DNA sequence: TCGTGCTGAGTGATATCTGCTTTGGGTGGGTGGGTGGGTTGAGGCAAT
DNA sequence: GCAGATATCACTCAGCACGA
């Protein structure tokens, strides 16, 4: 009853959305878009199966690209230290196996068996990859079915099986060279090709722009972290409160309104027109991406119907990457 | 004796499966084969085993299930039909445009890509294998290669046909190997003599072998499939068990062009890394292209959003649920899926259409024109393999009507399919001339 | 069990058999046979290993046929009819048809007292673009010849062709097992997809056709085998 | 005695051995006193064991109950002792003509169990015993050849208040910085700034345990890139000697997997295990790399995570775990050309990606200019081989005490000017937050040297002074 | 008050008996010998 | 021919009741 009272008090506040955005990743300094993306990824989206029997994905993938020395890995470490189910992996260390189902001979047995991997232990959870670029091409294509189909099919030695890995993958990548090139396009900066980029729900490029005021603020904050230890960090919501509130929201299953459907169609048309006669950055996935983001945003406010405002906010989040 | 293991899905997240040994006595032997989902009702017995006591160090007893009945895992089988149903299929086949309904009723949740639907339906229905005095063998399977831009509803269609097909095996390019595609050797615990397992291709004989991310497979694995594509048999030599296995299955492959996108200017040769032989072996090559158009994108967005809203989890009691499910199914499909699943099996089982008499000169003229216009550089020569594919697709199309007479309409439609498949694969510069020359057929 | 009777998706089952006295050396591998015998069990929970005790062998394998063949040879267009029977279902390629006929019949053996015996067998190379029925020709050649082996170059390896040195598991002694050519001795071997075959296997085939006696005599044993093919 | 000089004459006599531990079995329980219980009267008695034989009773010792052969052994109530078997390999020096070194088995009981680890040099005193070997399990028959082994009775693995009073005296010395910088590398001549930078790496920054986030580690990374003939490798070896843990990995002699960790299997246990690579083996020490430029970028990508997160995560072939690699990195590089050309910028002369050079806390540049006096003095210094410095034995204790006890805490005066210093560094323009964190770490490390619990303005001033004058103040 | 011949009882030594292999695997070897048998397949890592 | 686990038979000893 007391926890329920606290939960309803949490919901009652009309500034919940920005409060959660501020609370996420308290150690890092003022990265609102990335924190919003992490929150929406944590909430997730509704997964559905049509009358067909084919499954529509309901998870969200986010890739944060930035120059070295920026606050990329801090977000990943926070997610690993906060999410219910999650694992941490490195691009160079990870291989095709381990990141997927592996076939190893049974202990005290002559028969082969399937050993879980990073994408299996993180079922219904968030998986973190620190250096996406450093991963080999052979290993990169390993996570192609798990990203969209959400299933892993292996036909190795007498082990014909079709496993399921319904995991959300969050990764951090460096540019092709040393620093992000403003002139070159996103695909130009990253060695990742069209399919992988299309699979990813969002892209958050972080630029270490130079400014006196924000430089002073960042220096003061980072020095305060080392001087005052933890008391210098004051999230609006404690970790336990945040993990309770997130748990509450995930039970809701929002639905779409008619005007919201028409508005979403209009925004997809706008995105396709903007990309312009092929579309390298926008595919049919992006429509489902907007749907998932809108559903997650509706979950964040604890409502069971998506108003056009949530769709507009999701479009703003998606358009930012371009 | 068989080894029963827990279903991978039922196992909690990332836990080891648990296995037992089941003993089948008289009247139950050879009732199941590896790779089946079964339900076993029997007596759970135990007995003293000295080896277990010596190993573990405690008085533990071995346990095994003495089977009393084995069943496969609505009813018993959807593919099975009754005499009453066989009368319904004949009535439906009498429909003037049944073929169009079958094509439309296939993957309705996907809006566009009608050429994909036609090709995949033809592959599912299959052809009629032919033998001539034991001297000439003609394959009846139809192979379809899917190629196009990243987001085009490619893998989902393969997943759908996996469910629809009677005996289907799904393998991904990355997660596959030749040993798992041909066979694996085991040691029999009783006779201690090496036996031989079945492979992915073998398990899908007289069915379909779906391959996703085909371009990602290694060269050796891609050679392992050359034999099954044309020879329709796999040869094995391991542990002195030299023998030949039967593999007569159709292959549907999906891949994305080399470099991540299809450059319409360049030909299909450079676009995909597959070698000329395998490319030739494919019958229908439905190249997919993702362009930008206002009206098409509006329609696609409307359909996708309607599909998403229609399938929301929120949107006798069992009979009412079935009735609403049927309402939606008829909403997107002119023919119910359940009827189509049995229709495919019945057509593949009981009907073997044959060519009685038909004006050869039509297809001969089409072949001559194809060769005349294919001499242009950058176009693969039109070998007789295209003429064979025309006949195979004609037989499959006639199978749709459950008619043992291949009429003219089916042959012209097959000509259209093959001509369009060839035309789309070529470059733009040659595409203009090819489209100009071919008007009656397309 | 016969390939036809094998149910779909299952595997051929084997059965051990025993013969004594005048029923030995009556069959060779690859011959269809009909067996009359006793289905008995010999001890090797409380199970027994089945086997068959042979009592009669009737394999599907005079002067009248000699007269018929002699009359056939008297036909004035024997060459043309034989070239017609070669791949009746494949159009054109008459020169390849005649060459395949010559290969099927082969050349007379030559032996010299000194030791230099010339080769008599014939080999042919078909090198054309896809969609030309080369594989169909090879299949027909395999079927027609009394002894033939159809092998895919990429499907097999150095062990498949020529010969490979292995070890007997039961006795643990190094022994030699022949390849496709050894199994094709005295017959014809139809190799398909010469290109995909590895270079080491290609040079092995080079030696095998050069001497027709695969020389693998080392590694615990010094045995050699003939590969006249 | 030598492992190759033990004869039958020396059986059952006290000998002294020295060797290298190769492998030790887990703890083995050895019975000391047996426990018997009568099945009839439930009477319990304890009997001793002599020469590995149980003095079992024929019948119950009670008078009223005398049922014969009714006594049973209660396995879980007998007293037990500790036993362990070790394999000792003779030192490589003793090998006469380069053959496989011999090995001798050892037995240790009670306290000496788990006293020597694998791969350690020990000196063991024990009895050179001999024991028969049974020909087969099911007979008393014995082989004529006896097994030889050693019964160990002693093992030796080869701060006082007075020292603390002595150490506290040095700290009062005004020229402590120069004394330590001159004693760390006595031989190297006129490299005071390089020595100072090297010294501050040994002390290290300050450790912080930090919930609501992640741990912050005060480890300093130094790069020594310059002209060839200058003393770079010499300093690398000198520091390698001082540090308690460290691996002298080189360029093109190490692999990506070799540095982090190698997946293998244990034959004895038949289980999947993983070994420790060069970086992991240096946990808490200072890693040393000689030829950084002559290293494929595939392996260098491993160091990205070590210098940033102080951890390595591996996920492959069913092993998903993270190994701590809390170590300092000290690498050296040589110019692309035969020498360093001042004209072109730094990013061109030394190779390495520009971003990587920013990760390093300090990046020195030592060049061998030509002069009529510097060369003269250097020649006079390197020829004498054919200004006092502290003995190394005391210096190691000094650094260990400082690293263990002291824990500086930043002050407000430090922050007030650290913000200024960082913003000024960024204003003149490469300069990123990593430079500010490096300044923090260096200021904390220097305070450790003087044994202070508060970082003062002077220490941070020295840190910033060192940073500007490393790359060099053109 | 007591001395000794008869009896049941229980070990001691000795008679027959089974067993004398046993076993999968390279820190058990090949001067123990193949009529005692051993017939993978995926994944990781150095070389390049 | 050799060692080990097992069961067989024969011999001798402490108790008992009676008679001296
Ligand atoms: N015409 C369409 N109608 C409906 N949904 C479509 C259509 N085209 C694409 N989609 C959607 O696009 C998404 C793409 O995922 P899908 O599994 O179908 O293949 P993919 O991952 O894009 O394929 P590829 O292997 O070529 O990368 C799916 O959700 C599918 O629903
Ligand atoms: N004259 C012909 N008559 C009949 N079939 C022919 C003829 N020429 C070519 N073919 C074709 O040959 C095919 C079988 O041989 P196939 O094309 O596989 O040989 P191939 O060219 O060696 O193959 P590949 O080069 O692709 O490995 C048949 O499907 C067939 O119709
Ligand atoms: N905004 C920030 N807030 C707190 N710490 C920061 C911030 N920006 C950078 N840092 C610090 O700078 C260091 C360098 O970032 P790093 O994790 O190396 O980025 P990358 O993931 O690109 O390597 C981090 O360890 C972090 O503690
Ligand atoms: N300042 C110096 N002090 C002492 N020795 C020096 C000095 N400069 C050069 N040397 C001598 O020159 C040699 C340089 O070799 P080394 O240190 O291996 O150079 P690098 O490792 O940079 O290739 C050393 O052996 C050292 O004795
Ligand atoms: Mg796909
Ligand atoms: Mg061929
Ligand atoms: Mg050096
Ligand atoms: Zn007792």
């Amino acid at each position: 009853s007391d926890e329920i009272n606290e939960l309803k008090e949490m919901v009652k506040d009309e500034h919940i959305y920005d409060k959660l955005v501020r609370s996420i990743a308290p150690a890092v300094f003022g990265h609102e878009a990335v924190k919003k993306g992490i929150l929406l990824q944590m909430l997730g989206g509704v997964h559905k199966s049509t009358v067909e029997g084919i499954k529509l994905r309901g998870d969200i993938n986010i890739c944060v690209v930035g120059d070295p020395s920026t606050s990329k890995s801090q977000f990943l470490k926070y997610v690993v230290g906060f999410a219910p189910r999650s694992v941490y992996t490195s691009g160079k260390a990870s291989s095709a196996a381990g990141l997927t189902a592996a076939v190893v001979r049974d202990e005290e047995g002559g028969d082969y068996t399937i050993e879980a991997g990073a994408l299996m232990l993180a079922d219904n959870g968030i998986c973190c990859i620190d250096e996406f670029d450093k991963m080999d091409i052979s290993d990169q294509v390993a996570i192609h079915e798990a990203m969209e189909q959400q299933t892993i099919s292996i036909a190795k030695a007498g082990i014909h099986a079709t496993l399921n890995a319904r995991t959300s993958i969050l990764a951090a990548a460096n540019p092709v060279g040393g620093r992000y090139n403003r002139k070159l396009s996103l695909r130009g900066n990253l060695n990742m090709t069209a399919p992988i980029m299309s699979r990813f729900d969002l892209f958050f490029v972080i630029l270490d722009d130079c400014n006196e005021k924000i430089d002073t603020e960042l220096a003061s904050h980072i020095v305060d972290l080392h001087m005052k230890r933890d008391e210098a960090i004051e999230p609006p919501f404690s970790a336990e409160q945040l993990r309770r509130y997130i748990k509450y929201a995930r039970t809701f299953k929002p639905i779409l309104t008619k005007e919201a459907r028409s508005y979403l169609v209009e925004k997809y048309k706008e995105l396709r027109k903007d990309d312009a006669r092929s579309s390298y950055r926008i595919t049919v996935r992006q429509l489902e991406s907007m749907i998932r983001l809108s559903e997650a945003i509706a979950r964040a406010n604890c409502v069971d119907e998506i108003t056009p405002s949530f769709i507009a906010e999701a479009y703003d989040l998606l358009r930012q990457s371009i | 004796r068989v080894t029963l293991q827990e279903a991978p899905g039922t196992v909690p997240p990332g836990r080891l499966p648990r296995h037992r040994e089941v003993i089948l006595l008289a009247d139950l032997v050879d009732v199941s084969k590896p790779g089946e989902e079964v339900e076993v009702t029997g007596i759970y017995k135990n007995n003293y085993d000295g080896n277990l006591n010596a190993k573990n160090g405690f008085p533990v007893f071995a346990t095994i299930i003495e089977a009393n009945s084995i069943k496969r895992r609505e009813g018993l089988d959807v593919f099975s039909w009754t005499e009453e149903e066989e009368r319904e299929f004949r009535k439906i086949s009498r429909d003037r445009g049944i073929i169009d309904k079958i094509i439309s009723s296939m993957a309705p949740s996907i809006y566009g890509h009608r050429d994909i639907k036609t090709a995949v339906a033809c592959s599912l229905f299959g052809g009629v294998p032919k033998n001539v005095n034991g001297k000439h063998s003609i394959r009846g399977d139809i192979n379809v290669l899917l190629l196009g831009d990243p987001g085009t509803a490619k893998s989902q269609i393969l997943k759908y046909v996996e469910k629809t097909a009677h005996r289907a095996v799904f393998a991904t390019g990355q997660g596959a190997s030749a040993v798992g595609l041909t066979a694996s050797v085991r040691k029999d615990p009783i006779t201690k003599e090496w036996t031989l397992e079945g492979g992915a291709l073998v398990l899908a004989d007289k069915g379909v072998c779906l391959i996703d991310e085909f371009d990602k497979m290694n060269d050796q694995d891609r050679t392992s499939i050359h034999e099954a594509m044309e020879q329709q048999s796999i040869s094995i030599s391991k542990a002195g068990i030299v023998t030949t296995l039967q593999a007569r299955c159709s292959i549907i492959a999906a891949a994305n062009p080399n470099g991540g996108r299809y450059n319409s200017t360049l030909p299909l040769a450079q676009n995909v890394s597959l070698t000329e032989p395998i490319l030739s072996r494919f019958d229908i090559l439905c190249v997919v292209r993702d362009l930008v158009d206002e009206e098409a994108d509006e329609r696609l967005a409307t359909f996708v959003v309607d599909s998403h809203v229609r399938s929301h989890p929120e949107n006798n009691a069992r009979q009412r649920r079935l009735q609403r499910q049927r309402k939606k199914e008829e909403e997107i499909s002119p023919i119910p899926q359940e009827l189509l699943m049995k229709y495919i099996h019945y057509a593949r089982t009981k009907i073997y259409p044959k060519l009685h008499q038909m004006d050869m000169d039509k297809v001969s003229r089409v072949y001559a024109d194809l060769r005349r216009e294919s001499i242009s550089t950058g176009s693969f020569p039109i070998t007789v393999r295209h003429l064979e594919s025309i006949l195979r697709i004609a037989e499959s199309f006639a199978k749709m009507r459950l008619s043992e007479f291949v009429s003219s309409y089916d042959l012209d439609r097959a000509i259209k399919v093959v001509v369009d498949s060839f035309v789309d694969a070529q470059k733009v510069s040659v595409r203009r001339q090819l489209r100009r020359s071919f008007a009656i057929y397309t | 069990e016969i390939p036809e009777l094998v149910p779909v998706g299952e595997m051929p089952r084997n059965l051990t058999m025993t013969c004594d006295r005048y029923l030995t050396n009556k069959v060779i591998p690859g011959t269809r046979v009909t067996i009359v015998g006793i289905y008995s069990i010999y001890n090797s929970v409380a199970i027994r290993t089945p086997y068959i005790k042979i009592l009669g062998i009737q394999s599907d394998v005079t002067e009248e046929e000699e007269e018929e063949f002699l009359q056939l040879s008297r036909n004035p267009k024997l060459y043309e009819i034989l070239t017609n029977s070669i791949a009746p279902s494949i159009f054109g390629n008459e020169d390849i048809k005649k060459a395949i006929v010559c290969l099927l019949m082969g050349g007379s053996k030559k032996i010299l007292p000194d030791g230099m015996r010339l080769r008599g067998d014939i080999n042919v190379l078909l090198l054309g673009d896809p969609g030309t029925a080369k594989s169909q020709l090879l299949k027909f050649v395999e079927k027609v010849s009394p002894i033939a082996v159809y092998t895919s170059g990429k499907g097999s390896s150095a062990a498949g062709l020529t010969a490979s040195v292995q070890r007997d598991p039961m006795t643990r002694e190094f022994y030699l097992e022949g390849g496709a050519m050894v199994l094709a001795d005295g017959g014809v071997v139809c190799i398909d997809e010469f290109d995909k075959m590895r270079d080491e296997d290609r040079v092995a085939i080079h030696e095998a056709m050069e001497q027709q006696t695969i020389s693998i005599a080392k590694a615990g044993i010094t045995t050699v085998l003939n590969s006249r093919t | 005695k030598g492992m190759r000089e033990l004869n039958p004459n020396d059986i059952d006599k006290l000998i002294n051995l020295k060797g290298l531990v190769l492998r030790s079995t887990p703890v083995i329980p050895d019975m000391k006193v047996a426990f018997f219980k009568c099945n009839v009267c439930d009477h319990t008695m304890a009997v001793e064991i002599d020469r590995g034989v149980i003095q079992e009773p024929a019948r119950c010792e009670r008078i009223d109950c005398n049922e014969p052969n009714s006594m049973s052994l209660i396995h879980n109530r007998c007293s037990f002792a500790d036993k362990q078997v070790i394999k000792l390999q003779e030192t490589p020096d003793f090998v006469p003509d380069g053959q496989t070194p011999h090995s001798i088995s050892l037995c240790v009981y009670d306290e000496l169990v788990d006293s020597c680890r694998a791969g350690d040099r020990i000196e063991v005193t024990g009895t050179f015993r001999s024991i028969p070997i049974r020909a087969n399990s099911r007979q008393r028959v014995l082989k004529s050849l006896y097994k030889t082994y050693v019964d160990v009775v002693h093992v030796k693995k080869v701060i006082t208040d007075q020292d603390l009073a002595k150490i506290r005296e040095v700290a009062a010395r005004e020229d402590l910085y120069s004394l330590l910088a001159r004693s760390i590398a006595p031989s190297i001549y006129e490299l005071e700034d390089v020595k100072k930078g090297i010294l501050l790496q040994l002390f290290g920054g300050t450790n912080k345990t930090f919930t609501k986030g992640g741990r912050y580690r005060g480890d300093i990374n130094i790069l020594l890139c310059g002209d060839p003939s200058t003393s770079k490798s010499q300093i690398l070896q000198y520091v390698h000697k001082i540090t308690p843990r460290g691996v002298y990995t080189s360029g093109k002699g190490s692999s990506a997997v070799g540095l982090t960790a190698y997946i293998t299997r244990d034959v004895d246990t038949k289980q999947l295990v993983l070994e420790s690579g060069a970086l992991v083996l240096s946990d808490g020490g200072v890693c040393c790399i000689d030829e950084f430029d002559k290293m494929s970028d595939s392996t260098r990508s491993v160091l990205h995570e070590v210098m940033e997160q102080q951890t390595i995560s591996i996920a492959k072939a069913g092993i998903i775990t993270t190994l701590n690699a809390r170590s300092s990195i000290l690498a050296s590089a040589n110019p692309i050309g035969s020498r360093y050309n001042p004209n072109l910028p730094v990013t061109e002369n030394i190779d390495l990606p520009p971003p990587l050079l920013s990760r390093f806390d300090l990046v020195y540049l030592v060049l061998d200019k030509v002069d009529e006096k510097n060369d003269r003095e250097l020649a006079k210094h390197l020829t004498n081989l054919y200004d006092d410095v502290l003995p190394v034995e005391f210096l190691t204790m000094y650094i260990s005490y400082a690293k263990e006890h002291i824990h500086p805490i930043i002050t407000e005066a430090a922050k007030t000017e650290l913000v200024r210093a960082y913003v000024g560094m960024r204003k003149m323009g490469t300069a990123t937050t990593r430079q500010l964190e490096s300044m923090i770490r260096l200021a904390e490390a220097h305070a450790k040297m003087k044994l202070k619990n508060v970082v003062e303005l002077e220490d941070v001033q020295e840190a910033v002074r060192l940073i500007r004058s490393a790359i060099k103040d053109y």
Side-chain angles (χ1 to χ4, degrees), chain D residues 260-385:
Chain D
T260 70
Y262 168 49
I263 272 182
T264 168
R265 289 186 170 288
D266 207 317
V267 185
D268 168 60
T269 81
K270 300 302 195 145
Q271 303 187 234
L272 186 73
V273 285
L274 84 184
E275 292 266 44
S276 40
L279 291 165
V280 171
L281 257 161
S282 325
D283 159 22
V286 47
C287 204
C288 295
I289 312 189
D290 181 65
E291 308 250 315
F292 211 56
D293 46 26
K294 299 282 194 326
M295 212 178 263
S296 33
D297 54 9
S298 64
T299 86
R300 259 205 306 271
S301 86
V302 151
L303 296 199
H304 280 319
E305 281 166 340
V306 152
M307 311 185 108
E308 162 190 16
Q309 283 261 263
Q310 293 306 29
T311 323
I312 299 197
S313 297
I314 36 177
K316 54 217 187 92
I319 273 299
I320 163 172
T321 180
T322 85
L323 302 105
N324 292 0
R326 324 178 308 274
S327 61
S328 325
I329 297 208
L330 178 83
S332 86
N334 283 7
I336 282 85
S338 176
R339 294 171 71 279
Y340 187 98
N341 192 31
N343 303 355
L344 305 70
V346 190
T347 170
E348 178 281 342
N349 255 318
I350 308 284
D351 209 347
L352 283 55
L356 189 70
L357 273 168
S358 172
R359 272 189 219 253
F360 282 89
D361 289 345
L362 299 186
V363 61
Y364 279 106
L365 195 134
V366 53
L367 62 80
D368 61 359
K369 284 312 311 313
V370 202
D371 196 343
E372 271 146 0
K373 74 192 51 53
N374 183 62
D375 285 5
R376 158 173 286 286
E377 214 189 17
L378 169 55
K380 269 295 212 184
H381 177 106
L382 206 68
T383 204
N384 293 354
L385 266 66

Side-chain angles (χ1 to χ4, degrees), chain B residues 23-146:
Chain B
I23 282 167
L24 312 186
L25 303 177
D27 190 17
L28 281 178
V29 294
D30 269 16
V31 84
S32 60
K33 69 179 177 176
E36 290 189 55
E37 197 210 316
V38 282
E39 297 195 18
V40 192
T41 304
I43 310 100
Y44 186 41
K45 288 153 95 173
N46 73 330
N47 54 79
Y48 167 70
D49 175 347
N51 300 296
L52 251 54
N53 197 324
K55 199 177 63 173
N56 302 283
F58 283 68
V60 278
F61 280 14
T63 64
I64 55 198
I65 299 181
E66 194 204 302
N68 172 237
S69 64
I70 272 172
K71 279 284 167 34
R72 221 155 158 197
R73 264 282 174 157
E74 297 168 303
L76 300 187
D77 187 4
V78 302
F79 300 115
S80 36
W81 68 93
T82 72
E83 184 184 54
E84 168 269 305
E85 200 73 343
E86 171 166 349
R87 204 171 311 81
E88 171 60 289
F89 297 173
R90 203 63 48 177
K91 156 60 212 72
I92 275 279
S93 149
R94 225 73 63 74
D95 203 288
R96 306 304 311 288
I98 177 55
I99 167 179
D100 291 326
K101 305 190 102 69
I102 296 302
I103 273 169
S104 204
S105 295
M106 171 156 304
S109 189
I110 311 310
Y111 163 58
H113 314 297
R114 192 153 195 93
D115 62 36
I116 298 194
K117 298 181 177 182
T118 298
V120 56
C122 284
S123 178
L124 262 182
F125 266 130
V128 193
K130 317 188 209 210
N131 204 2
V132 183
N133 289 337
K135 325 165 92 175
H136 213 65
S137 178
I138 282 288
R139 83 184 202 229
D141 313 321
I142 312 172
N143 313 357
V144 196
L145 174 53
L146 276 159

Side-chain angles (χ1 to χ4, degrees), chain D residues 99-338:
Chain D
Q99 322 101 292
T100 63
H102 291 175
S103 37
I104 197 77
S105 316
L106 325 168
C107 277
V108 317
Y109 307 90
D110 278 4
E111 71 281 5
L112 308 186
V113 74
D114 278 339
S115 60
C116 51
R117 297 173 68 270
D120 307 62
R121 284 171 311 310
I122 57 176
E123 186 179 58
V124 301
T125 284
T127 319
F128 184 52
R129 296 267 272 112
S130 185
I131 220 69
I133 312 174
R134 281 158 67 129
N136 63 76
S137 60
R138 315 210 79 239
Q139 297 180 345
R140 289 199 313 289
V141 184
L142 301 174
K143 293 184 181 181
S144 76
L145 275 164
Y146 279 36
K147 184 77 186 85
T148 46
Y149 77 96
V150 178
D151 216 7
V152 186
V153 308
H154 182 274
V155 170
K156 164 176 293 306
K157 217 173 296 185
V158 154
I159 310 186
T160 81
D161 288 12
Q162 301 95 61
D163 316 300
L164 175 56
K166 155 53 201 163
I167 273 181
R168 297 288 298 210
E169 182 270 348
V170 154
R173 304 171 61 121
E174 75 301 345
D175 63 58
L176 172 59
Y177 207 19
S178 183
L179 194 91
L180 307 192
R182 196 159 65 265
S183 64
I184 178 175
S187 167
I188 272 51
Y189 146 82
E190 182 111 350
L191 259 74
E192 72 290 0
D193 271 304
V194 156
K195 301 160 105 73
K196 272 166 198 193
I198 291 295
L199 181 163
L200 300 179
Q201 191 190 16
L202 295 182
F203 279 75
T206 206
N207 269 236
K208 300 256 168 181
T209 322
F210 184 103
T211 187
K212 302 179 194 174
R215 62 149 184 276
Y216 289 68
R217 284 220 70 100
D219 283 4
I220 309 177
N221 321 266
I222 271 162
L223 207 175
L224 252 74
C225 60
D227 276 306
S229 167
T230 58
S231 323
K232 296 192 261 53
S233 293
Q234 283 291 345
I235 305 184
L236 270 279
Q237 303 275 18
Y238 262 36
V239 312
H240 180 262
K241 318 208 171 151
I242 301 308
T243 179
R245 339 176 175 71
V247 177
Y248 193 109
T249 166
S250 172
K252 276 299 211 312
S254 45
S255 191
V257 151
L259 288 175
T260 70
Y262 168 49
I263 272 182
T264 168
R265 289 186 170 288
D266 207 317
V267 185
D268 168 60
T269 81
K270 300 302 195 145
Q271 303 187 234
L272 186 73
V273 285
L274 84 184
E275 292 266 44
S276 40
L279 291 165
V280 171
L281 257 161
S282 325
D283 159 22
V286 47
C287 204
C288 295
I289 312 189
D290 181 65
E291 308 250 315
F292 211 56
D293 46 26
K294 299 282 194 326
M295 212 178 263
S296 33
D297 54 9
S298 64
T299 86
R300 259 205 306 271
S301 86
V302 151
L303 296 199
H304 280 319
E305 281 166 340
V306 152
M307 311 185 108
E308 162 190 16
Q309 283 261 263
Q310 293 306 29
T311 323
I312 299 197
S313 297
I314 36 177
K316 54 217 187 92
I319 273 299
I320 163 172
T321 180
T322 85
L323 302 105
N324 292 0
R326 324 178 308 274
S327 61
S328 325
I329 297 208
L330 178 83
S332 86
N334 283 7
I336 282 85
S338 176

Side-chain angles (χ1 to χ4, degrees), chain B residues 309-314 316-382:
Chain B
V309 82
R310 186 224 323 296
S311 81
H312 209 277
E314 70 91 358
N316 307 345
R318 184 200 64 258
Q319 296 173 0
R320 190 185 307 121
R321 180 198 65 182
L322 258 58
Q323 176 39 40
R324 56 188 63 235
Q325 211 86 353
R326 229 158 272 109
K327 290 309 308 189
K328 300 305 193 57
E329 170 183 61
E330 181 256 350
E331 221 198 68
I332 64 170
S333 34
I335 292 182
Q337 293 294 320
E338 279 71 347
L339 272 67
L340 216 171
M341 303 223 311
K342 305 196 254 289
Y343 195 63
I344 291 319
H345 206 41
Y346 173 78
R348 273 192 101 161
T349 317
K350 298 284 271 291
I351 298 314
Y352 310 86
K354 350 199 182 85
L355 322 173
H356 290 5
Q357 201 284 306
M358 166 37 216
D359 163 36
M360 305 183 199
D361 292 6
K362 183 188 295 187
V363 317
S364 324
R365 182 168 25 230
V366 195
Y367 179 49
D369 284 82
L370 290 205
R371 297 202 99 150
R372 167 158 38 110
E373 309 293 345
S374 184
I375 197 71
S376 304
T377 61
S379 73
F380 296 143
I382 292 285

Side-chain angles (χ1 to χ4, degrees), chain B residues 30 134 136 196 223 227, chain C residues 11 13 136 143 154-155:
Chain B
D30 269 16
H136 213 65
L196 188 147
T223 51
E227 318 197 23
Chain C
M11 302 273 285
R13 305 256 272 283
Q136 280 285 18
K143 192 63 164 309
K154 182 50 164 54

